[PDB]
Design a protein around this ligand. Structure first.
Ligand SMILES: O=c1[nH]cc(Br)c2sc(-c3ccncc3)cc12
Ligand SMILES: O=c1[nH]cc(Br)c2sc(-c3ccncc3)cc12
Lengths: 347, 23, 348, 22
């Protein structure tokens, strides 16, 4: 069937127009709603359509958030439209289709008993940090960073952050739910019940993604909420009283047995690039303010190879765009631009 | 550990209990 | 007992001048000559007088290099003067340097004898200052050619480091051959062992890397019993080089076939409690490919040194850190964008 | 003397590996 709807450009306009699409197939289904894949008639371009049930007397956070964003490492909202039980309204987010995920790529290497090539680890993580620098600059926190939410174009190695259904614009003083983020990637302050956390929970989750890419498996595979901390404590040891206060000021534990951190160099396999372990240690900190900012993470020595004029993908292809920074993306530390953008990148 | 985690956070026993579960 | 000489100031006028000193005591001997300690009558300040046999009509390289240099991390030349033995044409050159009581070598050995690893804060501080002094000399095309712990002077109170012994130093000119048998064996870059004469100042960065590793291990990383054995020790860690790396080290050397050894993982070279940022830095210094090594300024900007950029940092002795961020434009010449990392907010 | 000869003859690496496996 060819479906024709009236839809508003994501950016916008925003003046509604007719959009036609076909080859509709279900690719996802959960308690969030359904995701379809489809083909736009004018373009032949593939799209994913995320159908969600909407309270028609309230506004969608994910829509409002998605409308603000325009970045080469974020899934683009092309259109949105309303459907569809009688008085039931559905919101439909029309997104660019991206066929692979960092999850499925890493799992292929994992099942083959081998590690993802270092160059890809640099590429994917760097593009992830860029997307985070961008969304954080509006005060938006993603709140669900994990490999399944990192889309990959298998040929060009472009990464796009997706699934803003947990995302929120964080306002200081105004509390936020603590049971958030997938368990393996959940920052310790959340486990401790923090409601006054910051965007730096995304950096923790990005650290977990990094460590996972290095190990071939999740660094903190908790069987539950409490076990998630057990897992964290096996690597980082117990937090100090000053780290507890930094994570959640409203939490007090007067007596507990203190455990020393396990050395980072033993967490990872012997062959693991020391610079990856160095980066990881600056992301997986108990103290939220001690974690690197995404921009800081981008400027780290570990991504030096990406700033090299002669760099290439293992498939011979040139790497995707890495240096097209905007004032918005650089706003947390504008001077950094001269390190992030190498001499050979400038027009 | 949902109601368990809640109890643990409210009672001030999280680290104590996590440490115990370590061994 | 006052000794008085006509000496020429190290920097500035060039107009000679009478200089008086007292309390002359021997502090060092060797084939190089002799170093004395002495006290300036004019201000009480302690000086080291390096006496070297020097043949006119010839330029002393060390002297000419030392006259160019004014830097907080380099031993300062206050005066120079010539003196004669008594055996006709027996002339000595005397370099009057600022006296500095300790060395990185003696501090490290103190910790090693007490069965302690040098505290990481001191490792950050010593190395940072070394790289800063390397950035400075390299900006004039000067290559030290003898970086090693015995050549890094230390004020134990302030933790100020000063590079000394420019007796192997040379202003490098691209195109002009330099001698290969240079540097102390343990700190000698692999391109030198491979006989290269077209090397650059990145040989000092290799040597710096050997000093880093030594501070982490409590002993030299590459302790060869000879020149050939020196490469063996390097191979035990780096493995054999690739054909491409060989060409980068010395393009006038070829070896068609040799048996491959693999690199030993960096995380196993050091003990488990070694900070991973330290290992990471090390792996970027101890590379076969000379151009692949960090520049001294890039080294200063490495995350291993972030603690030094924290407004709250203190020496274990309670004192503030020495001057770390007072970079001149000369110092930043090779790479201005790095000022963003190198000069922290609180120091502008 | 010996290093010098191995450099010129192009036998350095070969000889170093051999010494390591002694
Ligand atoms: O936001 C989302 N929540 C759940 C699923 Br399942 C998917 S699948 C998807 C996608 C797939 C391919 N290209 C673009 C987006 C987005 C989302
Ligand atoms: O250049 C040098 N070659 C050999 C020795 Br031994 C020394 S000892 C020294 C020094 C000692 C204390 N303060 C300043 C300089 C310099 C030198």
């Amino acid at each position: 069937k060819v479906t024709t709807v009236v839809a508003t450009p994501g950016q916008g306009p925003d003046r509604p127009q007719e959009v036609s699409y076909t080859d509709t197939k279900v690719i996802g289904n959960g308690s969030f709603g359904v995701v379809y894949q489809a083909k736009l008639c004018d373009s032949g371009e593939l799209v994913a359509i995320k159908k969600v049930l909407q309270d028609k007397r309230f506004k969608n956070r994910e829509l409002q958030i998605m409308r603000k964003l325009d970045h080469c490492n974020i899934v683009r909202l092309r259109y949105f439209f309303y459907s569809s039980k009688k008085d039931e309204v559905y919101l439909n987010l029309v997104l660019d289709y991206v066929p692979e995920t960092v999850y499925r790529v890493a799992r292929h290497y994992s099942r083959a008993k081998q590690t993802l090539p270092v160059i890809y680890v640099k590429l994917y993580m760097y593009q992830l940090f860029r997307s985070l620098a961008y969304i954080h600059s509006f005060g938006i926190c993603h709140r669900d960073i994990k490999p399944q939410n990192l889309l990959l174009d298998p040929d060009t190695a472009v990464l796009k952050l997706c699934d803003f259904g947990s995302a929120k614009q964080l306002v200081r003083g105004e509390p936020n739910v603590s049971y958030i983020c997938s368990r393996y990637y959940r920052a310790p302050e959340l486990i401790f019940g923090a409601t006054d956390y910051t965007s730096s929970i995304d950096v923790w989750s990005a650290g977990c993604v990094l460590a996972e890419l290095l190990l071939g498996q999740p660094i903190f595979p908790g069987d539950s909420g409490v076990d998630q901390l057990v897992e964290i404590i096996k690597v980082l040891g117990t937090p100090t009283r000053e780290q507890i206060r930094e994570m959640n000021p409203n939490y007090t534990e007067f007596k507990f047995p203190q455990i020393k951190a396990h050395p980072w160099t033993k967490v990872f396999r012997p062959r693991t690039p020391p610079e990856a372990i160095a980066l990881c240690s600056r992301l997986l900190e108990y103290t939220p303010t001690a974690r690197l900012t995404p921009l800081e993470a981008c400027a780290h020595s570990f991504f030096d190879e990406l700033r090299d004029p002669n760099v290439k993908l293992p498939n011979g292809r040139d790497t995707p765009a890495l240096f097209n920074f905007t004032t918005q993306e650089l706003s947390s530390n504008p001077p950094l631009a001269t390190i992030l953008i190498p001499p050979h990148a400038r027009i | 550990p949902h109601r368990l985690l809640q109890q643990l956070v409210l009672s001030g026993n999280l680290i104590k209990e996590a440490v115990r579960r370590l061994h």
